[PDB]
């Protein structure tokens, strides 16, 4: 059976929480987070990858205007690599693509998508693969000002996907099952940059509607 609790932060698969600023690059941080997890799993090394590389170079996405994680993974595969954060620093603004092979830190062989709305499939992926990129409805004031506990709001709309984050684990808190989510709004947001979101509560906030992970 799959573990009843998994927390990749404890296994050293997760880099520190970042702050995306005003740029709508949540999709880039979500993608990089998933790649960072696979890189650690494959090479045993953990390092910050470049979301700016993705913002400036994934032509299929809209830079600071938004984009999909699947398109980001496809880029890394076709481009044959993505630079480290140190080599291509985050600025928080769209600029011409400056990718350079010299700073390459990871590669990608493709990606897989989680069946729409299937939390059991998402659980399997987090348990057997690692951190997974996911999209959610983060438009509610209750989410914006989250501080502690298992987040659940009857007003969340699973069809209103407007933000991308990273699932780095799952567990239970005071009898309530949850997903451990890494956001990209800085360490001062939520619980040191993280939020626990309701698990197995009918795909709350659309947690399993647009999930995917990279193949390495
Ligand atoms: C995260 N900070 C963030 N900010 C703004 C977002 C806008 C969108 C919606 C969106 C815009 C553009 C695209 N691409 C370009 C056009 N092609 C046709 C499709 C891809 C995709 C999506 N998002 C998304 C919300 C849902 C999760 C992914 C990001 C924004 N996210």
163 lines ligand 1 (CB under 6 A): yes
- Write phi, then psi, for 64 (nearest 5 degrees): -75, 0
29 lines ligand 1 (CB under 6 A): no
205 is an active site residue: no
Q: Using the mean position of ligand 1's atoms as its centre, give its distance from the Cα of residue 10 in Å.
A: 30
Q: Using the mean position of ligand 1's atoms as its centre, give its distance from the Cα of residue 45 in Å.
A: 30
User: CA triplet 213, 162, 183: central angle to 5 degrees?
Assistant: 60
**Which of 23, 27, 166 to mutate for ligand 1's pocket (most ligand atoms within 8 Å of CB)?**
27
Distance set, CA 63 to CA 26, 54, 173 (Å)? 10, 8, 37
The count of structural domains within the chain is: 1
What secondary structure does DSSP assign to the chain, as a single string? ---S-EETTTTT--PPP-B-TTS--HHHHHHHHHHHHHHHHHHS----B-HHHHHHH-TTS-GGG---HHHHHHHHHHHT-EEBTTTS---SS-------GGGEEE---EEEEPPTT-HHHHHHHHHHT--EEEEE---SHHHHT--SSEE--TT--TT---EEEEEEEEEEETTEEEEEEE-SB-TTSTBTTEEEEESSSSSGGGTTSS-EEEE-
Q: What is the CATH number of the domain that holds 139?
A: 3.90.70.10
**Angle formed by the axes of helices 26-43 and 69-79, to 10°?**
50
- Residue 26's domain comprises 1-216
Which residue, by CA, sits nearest to atom 16 of ligand 1?
A: 61
57 is an active site residue: no
* PDB resolution in Å: 2.0
């Amino acid at each position: 059976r799959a573990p009843d609790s998994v927390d990749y932060r404890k296994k050293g698969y997760v880099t520190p929480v970042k702050n995306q600023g005003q740029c709508g690059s949540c999709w880039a941080f979500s993608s990089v987070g998933a790649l960072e997890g696979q890189l650690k799993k494959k090479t045993g090394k953990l390092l910050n990858l470049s979301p700016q590389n993705l913002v400036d170079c994934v032509s299929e996405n809209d830079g600071c205007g938004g984009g999909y994680m699947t398109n980001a993974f496809q880029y890394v595969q076709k481009n044959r690599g993505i630079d480290s954060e140190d080599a291509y620093p985050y600025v928080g603004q769209e600029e011409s693509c400056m990718y350079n092979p010299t700073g390459k830190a990871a590669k990608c062989r493709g990606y897989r998508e989680i069946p729409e709305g299937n939390e059991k499939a998402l659980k399997r992926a987090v348990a057997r693969v690692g951190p997974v990129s996911v999209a959610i409805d983060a438009s509610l004031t209750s989410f914006q000002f989250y501080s502690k506990g298992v987040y659940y709001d009857e007003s969340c709309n699973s069809d209103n996907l407007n933000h991308a984050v990273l699932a780095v684990g799952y567990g239970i808190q005071k009898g309530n099952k949850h997903w451990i989510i890494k956001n990209s709004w800085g360490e001062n947001w939520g619980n040191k940059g993280y939020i626990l979101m309701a698990r197995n509560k009918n795909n709350a906030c659309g947690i399993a509607n647009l999930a995917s992970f990279p193949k390495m």
